[PDB]
Design an enzyme around this catalytic site. Structure first.
Site, PDB file in Angstrom:
ATOM      1  N   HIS A 113       0.862  -1.171   0.000  1.00 53.45           N
ATOM      2  CA  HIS A 113       0.000   0.000   0.000  1.00 53.45           C
ATOM      3  C   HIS A 113       0.901   1.223   0.000  1.00 53.45           C
ATOM      4  O   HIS A 113       2.068   1.142   0.388  1.00 53.45           O
ATOM      5  CB  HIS A 113      -0.912   0.016   1.230  1.00 53.45           C
ATOM      6  CG  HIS A 113      -2.183  -0.750   1.047  1.00 53.45           C
ATOM      7  ND1 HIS A 113      -3.049  -0.517   0.001  1.00 53.45           N
ATOM      8  CD2 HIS A 113      -2.731  -1.754   1.773  1.00 53.45           C
ATOM      9  CE1 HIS A 113      -4.077  -1.341   0.092  1.00 53.45           C
ATOM     10  NE2 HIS A 113      -3.908  -2.102   1.159  1.00 53.45           N
ATOM     11  N   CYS A 161      -0.329   2.412  -4.492  1.00 52.83           N
ATOM     12  CA  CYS A 161      -1.112   3.634  -4.654  1.00 52.83           C
ATOM     13  C   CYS A 161      -0.244   4.817  -4.263  1.00 52.83           C
ATOM     14  O   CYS A 161       0.685   4.676  -3.464  1.00 52.83           O
ATOM     15  CB  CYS A 161      -2.354   3.614  -3.761  1.00 52.83           C
ATOM     16  SG  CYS A 161      -3.631   2.454  -4.272  1.00 52.83           S
TER      17      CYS A 161
HETATM   18  C1  HQC Z   1      -3.343   1.068  -3.136  1.00 56.40           C
HETATM   19  O1  HQC Z   1      -2.657   1.219  -2.139  1.00 56.40           O
HETATM   20  C2  HQC Z   1      -3.614  -0.327  -3.640  1.00 56.40           C
HETATM   21  C3  HQC Z   1      -2.456  -0.793  -4.524  1.00 56.40           C
HETATM   22  C4  HQC Z   1      -2.061  -2.227  -4.229  1.00 56.40           C
HETATM   23  O2  HQC Z   1      -2.425  -2.764  -3.158  1.00 56.40           O
HETATM   24  O3  HQC Z   1      -1.373  -2.840  -5.075  1.00 56.40           O
HETATM   25  N1  HQC Z   1      -4.884  -0.413  -4.345  1.00 56.40           N
HETATM   26  C5  HQC Z   1      -6.047  -0.575  -3.704  1.00 56.40           C
HETATM   27  O4  HQC Z   1      -6.120  -0.787  -2.502  1.00 56.40           O
HETATM   28  C6  HQC Z   1      -7.297  -0.493  -4.543  1.00 56.40           C
HETATM   29  C7  HQC Z   1      -8.220  -1.660  -4.211  1.00 56.40           C
HETATM   30  C8  HQC Z   1      -8.014  -2.814  -5.183  1.00 56.40           C
HETATM   31  C9  HQC Z   1      -8.211  -4.155  -4.486  1.00 56.40           C
HETATM   32  C10 HQC Z   1      -9.679  -4.567  -4.433  1.00 56.40           C
HETATM   33  N2  HQC Z   1     -10.289  -4.650  -5.751  1.00 56.40           N
HETATM   34  C11 HQC Z   1     -10.809  -5.778  -6.231  1.00 56.40           C
HETATM   35  O5  HQC Z   1     -11.032  -6.749  -5.521  1.00 56.40           O
HETATM   36  C12 HQC Z   1     -11.128  -5.854  -7.696  1.00 56.40           C
HETATM   37  C13 HQC Z   1     -12.419  -6.187  -8.105  1.00 56.40           C
HETATM   38  C14 HQC Z   1     -12.703  -6.258  -9.466  1.00 56.40           C
HETATM   39  C15 HQC Z   1     -11.689  -5.997 -10.384  1.00 56.40           C
HETATM   40  C16 HQC Z   1     -11.950  -6.072 -11.751  1.00 56.40           C
HETATM   41  C17 HQC Z   1     -10.929  -5.814 -12.670  1.00 56.40           C
HETATM   42  C18 HQC Z   1      -9.653  -5.483 -12.215  1.00 56.40           C
HETATM   43  C19 HQC Z   1      -9.395  -5.411 -10.845  1.00 56.40           C
HETATM   44  O6  HQC Z   1      -8.173  -5.095 -10.428  1.00 56.40           O
HETATM   45  C20 HQC Z   1     -10.413  -5.666  -9.928  1.00 56.40           C
HETATM   46  N3  HQC Z   1     -10.169  -5.601  -8.606  1.00 56.40           N
HETATM   47  C21 HQC Z   1      -8.064   0.792  -4.371  1.00 56.40           C
HETATM   48  C22 HQC Z   1      -8.949   1.282  -5.337  1.00 56.40           C
HETATM   49  C23 HQC Z   1      -9.502   2.518  -4.910  1.00 56.40           C
HETATM   50  C24 HQC Z   1      -9.086   2.899  -3.691  1.00 56.40           C
HETATM   51  S1  HQC Z   1      -7.978   1.819  -3.006  1.00 56.40           S
END
Ligand code: HQC
Ligand code: HQC
Lengths: 173, 88, 88, 173
Positions: A113, A161
């Protein structure tokens, strides 16, 4: 075949290696002999956290990067779930590794993160920040603090992020 | 005798997104930036220097969708082209 | 209809030195980074994309002297090669 | 001959323009027709300062950059001795220029004193800081604040110190 040490990585043939040696002059980084070189790489991946959401899927990234860097000829250190201080300690230890002397390059991979200011350690919260700054990664690996890697490519990859924003704006056609 | 060297040289950083912005990750498929980097590395390490490869990774993100991001190359002090010469 | 675009894309910054460090300037000859950039632009704009040119400027600083500096390319989001095509 | 509009800049011939169009596919930034395009460039140069040493020789840099960007086909705005707020105001005005709509790219040149944190305005002192951050330059020129330059190369050149350090370390052979 992907059965060899390079796996899924497409090989550069000797003819291709000569054309690159020709199209660009003495503007390519020298590579050391394969028989003697000791290439090192380090992956630091944080998945389990104290106060922020679990980074589910990180294991797939660890596997992919580990195998990739091995395919490219690097011996890979994998460190998991570290605080910013632990990351610093590991980076300092990595910069001190004698193999870098008999290496031509390095790769550093950080997967965690992150916020605008940098990369989140395992103990990170908005109340008690635990951040490793990109600036410090460079400092620890520069010519002063890592003389072994002088004149040698140091590639730093960061999956993280850099804030809360979606990175998008609207426009009409 | 002693000689001078640049304190900072031969670096390249590649970040998953631009400053202020999120980067995406799938719970079973892994992070998209990471998966994309491997794919491009596997394909282009034989023919392109790492800087070129990184640009190509960027280009692959050009068309934005519901989960958009733009990987960023940072603090570059490479003075030469870095070719991986896979197989060598 | 409305469409999504990346908020930050197609940027390249070129700084005169690395972070923490000074950059040099002659009182009659001007700044060395600036003079070097013009010289390389004049020479290579016809054949190289700006990223290549910037790397070549960097390479020209490789051998350090009494007044050393290492120009740095920063925050790159160019998805394609930028050719100036001088004369066109 | 350097008598033409491109001056000392070596020309790219039509044969050279075709080879580049061939060696790389649709991975080159499109350039607009020369007859209709309105390319813009901005140089902000600070030489005279209130509380810090005069930047003697800056005029040579202004001349060189102005002529270079003109040679490359850009109409050049030259602004001198501005505070950080004045720089912001000018940048904001530059981002609002209608010519960017009929342009394919831009160049931004900053030439001043600087510190680790950014570029020094005319009124800068250690007591009263007057700094423009690189981050703010990007923000003002991005897709949100400068939609005209969407998908178009924005090249930012900065001549400035980034701290007090000489940038060198010693080593023995
Ligand atoms: C930021 O610190 C992190 C980067 C990292 O951990 O590598 N990103 C986040 O925390 C994201 C959340 C992404 C994880 C949860 N998302 C999913 O489960 C998900 C559902 C459906 C899809 C469909 C297509 C592609 C995907 O990657 C996907 N992921 C954040 C997003 C906004 C705020 S935090
Ligand atoms: C940092 O903010 C500025 C960058 C800038 O103004 O573009 N750099 C400095 O202020 C330099 C001082 C350089 C100007 C004075 N130096 C000379 O007059 C001088 C004498 C002799 C030579 C010989 C060769 C090449 C030269 O460039 C040269 N210059 C600083 C240096 C250390 C601390 S500040």
């Amino acid at each position: 075949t992907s059965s060899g040490s390079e796996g899924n990585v497409k090989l550069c043939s000797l003819e291709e290696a000569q054309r690159i040696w020709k199209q660009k002059s003495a503007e390519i980084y020298p590579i050391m002999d394969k028989s003697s070189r000791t290439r090192l790489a380090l992956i630091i991946c944080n998945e389990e956290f104290d106060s922020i959401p679990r980074r589910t899927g990180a294991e797939v990234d660890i596997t992919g990067m580990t195998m990739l860097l091995q395919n490219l000829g690097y011996s890979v250190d994998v460190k998991k779930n570290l605080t910013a201080s632990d990351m610093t300690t590991e980076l300092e230890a990595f910069a001190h590794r004698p193999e870098h002397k008999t290496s031509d390059s390095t790769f550093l991979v950080f997967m965690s993160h992150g916020i605008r200011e940098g990369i989140c350690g395992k103990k990170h919260s908005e109340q008690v920040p635990d951040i490793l700054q990109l600036n410090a990664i460079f400092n620890m690996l520069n010519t002063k603090n890592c003389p072994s890697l002088k004149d040698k490519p140091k590639v730093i990859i960061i999956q993280a992020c850099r804030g809360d924003s979606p990175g998008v704006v609207w426009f009409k056609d | 005798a002693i000689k001078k060297a640049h304190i900072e040289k031969d670096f390249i950083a590649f970040c998953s997104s631009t400053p202020d912005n999120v980067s995406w990750r799938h719970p079973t498929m892994g992070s998209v930036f990471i998966g994309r980097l491997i794919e491009h590395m596997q394909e282009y390490a034989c023919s392109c220097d790492v800087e070129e490869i990184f640009r190509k990774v960027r280009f692959s993100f050009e068309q934005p969708d519901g989960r958009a991001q733009m990987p960023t190359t940072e603090r570059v002090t490479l003075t030469r082209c870095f070719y991986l010469f896979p197989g060598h």
